[PDB]
Amino acid sequence: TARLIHTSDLDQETRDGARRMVIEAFRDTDDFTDDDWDHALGGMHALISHHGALIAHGAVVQRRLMYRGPDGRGHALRCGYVEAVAVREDRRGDGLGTAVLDALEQVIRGAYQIGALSASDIARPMYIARGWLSWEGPTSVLTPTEGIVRTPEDDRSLFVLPVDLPDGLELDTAREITCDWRSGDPW
Amino acid sequence: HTARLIHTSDLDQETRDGARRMVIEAFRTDDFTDDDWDHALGGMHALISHHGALIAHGAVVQRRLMYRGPDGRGHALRCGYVEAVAVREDRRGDGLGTAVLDALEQVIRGAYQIGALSASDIARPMYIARGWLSWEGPTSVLTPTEGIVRTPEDDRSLFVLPVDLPDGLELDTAREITCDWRSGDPW
Ligand SMILES: CC(C)(COP(=O)(O)OP(=O)(O)OC[C@H]1O[C@@H](n2cnc3c(N)ncnc32)[C@H](O)[C@@H]1OP(=O)(O)O)[C@@H](O)C(=O)NCCC(=O)NCCS
Numbered sequence: 025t026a027r028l029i030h031t032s033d034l035d036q037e038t039r040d041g042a043r044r045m046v047i048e049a050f051r052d053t054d055d056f057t058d059d060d061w062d063h064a065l066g067g068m069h070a071l072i073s074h075h076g077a078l079i080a081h082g083a084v085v086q087r088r089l090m091y092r093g094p095d096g097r098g099h100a101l102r103c104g105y106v107e108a109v110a111v112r113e114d115r116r117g118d119g120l121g122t123a124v125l126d127a128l129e130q131v132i133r134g135a136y137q138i139g140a141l142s143a144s145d146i147a148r149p150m151y152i153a154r155g156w157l158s159w160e161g162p163t164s165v166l167t168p169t170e171g172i173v174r175t176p177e178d179d180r181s182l183f184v185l186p187v188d189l190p191d192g193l194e195l196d197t198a199r200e201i202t203c204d205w206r207s208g209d210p211w
Numbered sequence: 212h213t214a215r216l217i218h219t220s221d222l223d224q225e226t227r228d229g230a231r232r233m234v235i236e237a238f239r240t241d242d243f244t245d246d247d248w249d250h251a252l253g254g255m256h257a258l259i260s261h262h263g264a265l266i267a268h269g270a271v272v273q274r275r276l277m278y279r280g281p282d283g284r285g286h287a288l289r290c291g292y293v294e295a296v297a298v299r300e301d302r303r304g305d306g307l308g309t310a311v312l313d314a315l316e317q318v319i320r321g322a323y324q325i326g327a328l329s330a331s332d333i334a335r336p337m338y339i340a341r342g343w344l345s346w347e348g349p350t351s352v353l354t355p356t357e358g359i360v361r362t363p364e365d366d367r368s369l370f371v372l373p374v375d376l377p378d379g380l381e382l383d384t385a386r387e388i389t390c391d392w393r394s395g396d397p398w
């Protein structure tokens with residue numbers, strides 16, 4: 025039931041409608057920040073509206089995830105990173121979230137080497153059920169002034185969906201995995 | 212000439228193979244490598260067709276460009292990076308290149324803070340004409356194991372299109388600009 029739209033083609037009221045719905049959906053200090061919204065921009069949005077109202081949203085945005093295999097090689101994987109997955113609270117538990125992820129996984133499978141996200145510890149079983157793989161190793165970020173810095177807080181949160189890895193590569197989820205730099209939450 | 216815009220994930224197999232075949236030839240060790248094709252995926256494609264065959268391609272993919280302002284604050288700018296802009300040999304100088312860049316710039320203005328690209332020499336006038344800023348400072352890449360490494364080869368090639376810079380950001384082309392890491396040509 026989800027409509028796929030590039031940030032590009034969102035009119036002002038859809039952007040404001042989506043942002044307002046996502047900010048409210050992540051309230052149980054505003055949990056969903058300006059940086060969190062920046063992270064949701066530049067890729068494909070999955071939207072579900074009912075009678076003029078936005079009731080569901082998700083985004084998949086491109087970045088690189090860094091992974092070194094046991095042959096020592098080093099890979100910068102073309103990643104579809106899942107952001108701002110949200111359903112208006114009264115509309116939850118009726119398959120809308122599923123419909124949003126169904127549409128984002130179509131993007132990921134069609135365009136990227138790997139899907140990734142850092143799930144709220146509440147949503148973790150929903151991803152595990154879709155066949156997303158929990159990372160077991162240490163997580164880190166490639167910083168511009170320090171080098172690769174550990175992100176222990178994101179170790180339990182990181183999920184991957186390896187859709188089309190290069191060469192022979194099969195990930196070992198016990199190895200380290202490193203995200204590229206951005207402001208706010210790196211994961 | 213009007214380009215149609217399509218996400219990587221919506222390309223049918225024949226159009227994907229068609230685009231890569233046309234782009235490899237337009238750039239003709241082949242000059243257009245497997246990494247070069249990798250770099251053109253994950254974003255929006257501009258396509259122009261004629262007599263059932265592709266005559267023009269380009270792509271805009273999301274990455275981060277790192278820039279430090281005169282107030283010492285580091286920015287990780289949401290970048291629409293332009294890749295694989297190509298017009299079939301027999302169709303050059305009819306404005307097809309212009310139509311491709313018009314559609315990609317629609318994406319960049321609609322979704323990103325900055326546009327960037329590392330132009331071949333033959334393409335340079337086309338960018339200078341469209342009002343892309345030539346960079347005058349040193350360029351670098353953020354590497355995983357060596358920190359920020361100068362990319363002197365790319366100093367003369369870099370164009371940016373600054374469309375929606377964060378508050379308090381004066382883009383000075385004399386200063387250093389750093390791309391995020393990827394395999395192959397970092398720029
Ligand atoms: C997480 C969220 C998007 C789920 O959306 P939803 O429309 O309730 O979910 P669905 O009905 O499609 O179900 C998602 C899965 O969660 C579980 N689930 C079952 N009932 C549920 C309910 N009422 N609410 C949430 N999850 C439920 C099931 O495993 C379900 O899979 P199913 O469709 O096979 O039953 C939504 O609750 C939300 O917006 N939460 C707050 C913001 C947030 O945490 N989202 C992103 C975290 S990474």
Ligand SMILES: CC(C)(COP(=O)(O)OP(=O)(O)OC[C@H]1O[C@@H](n2cnc3c(N)ncnc32)[C@H](O)[C@@H]1OP(=O)(O)O)[C@@H](O)C(=O)NCCC(=O)NCCS
Pocket residue numbers: 237238295296297298299302303304305306307308309310329330331333334336337340
């Ligand atoms: C993309 C490419 C075909 C240029 O496309 P094109 O169809 O020749 O370009 P257009 O006709 O749209 O315009 C090219 C520009 O050349 C310039 N130009 C126009 N007439 C010219 C002339 N007589 N002499 C020289 N330059 C001229 C103009 O700036 C023109 O833009 P405009 O027509 O909007 O004014 C060329 O870059 C290419 O395909 N080469 C191989 C692949 C490649 O190197 N691409 C690199 C992208 S970085």
Ligand SMILES: NC[C@@H]1O[C@H](O[C@H]2[C@@H](O)[C@H](O[C@@H]3[C@@H](O)[C@H](N)C[C@H](N)[C@H]3O[C@H]3O[C@H](CO)[C@@H](O)[C@H](O)[C@H]3N)O[C@@H]2CO)[C@H](N)[C@@H](O)[C@@H]1O
Pocket residue numbers: 050051052055056057060061063106107108109141142143144145177178181209211
């Ligand atoms: N008052 C409600 C709050 O909800 C919060 O909900 C969760 C989310 O806000 C956030 O979830 C993860 C986080 O686990 C992980 N370590 C970092 C990751 N970037 C966050 O990401 C998630 O939430 C943010 C919005 O905050 C979204 O931008 C992002 O797309 C989404 N996947 O962190 C929280 C998980 O600890 C918290 N559980 C807690 O602060 C509190 O219960």
Ligand SMILES: NC[C@@H]1O[C@H](O[C@H]2[C@@H](O)[C@H](O[C@@H]3[C@@H](O)[C@H](N)C[C@H](N)[C@H]3O[C@H]3O[C@H](CO)[C@@H](O)[C@H](O)[C@H]3N)O[C@@H]2CO)[C@H](N)[C@@H](O)[C@@H]1O
Pocket residue numbers: 238242243244247248250293294295296328329330331332333364365368396398
């Ligand atoms: N060597 C001079 C000329 O190089 C041309 O080819 C150029 C392009 O192939 C390539 O241009 C730039 C490059 O300058 C810069 N330092 C790095 C950047 N990634 C390259 O990028 C460009 O070409 C590659 C394809 O190779 C594309 O994938 C990319 O999208 C495109 N903008 O590098 C070459 C140097 O400018 C032509 N083969 C020919 O006119 C002539 O040989």
Ligand SMILES: [Ca+2]
Pocket residue numbers: 055056057060
């Ligand atoms: Ca947050």
Ligand SMILES: [Ca+2]
Pocket residue numbers: 241242243244247
């Ligand atoms: Ca090349």
Ligand SMILES: [Ca+2]
Pocket residue numbers: none
């Ligand atoms: Ca080959």
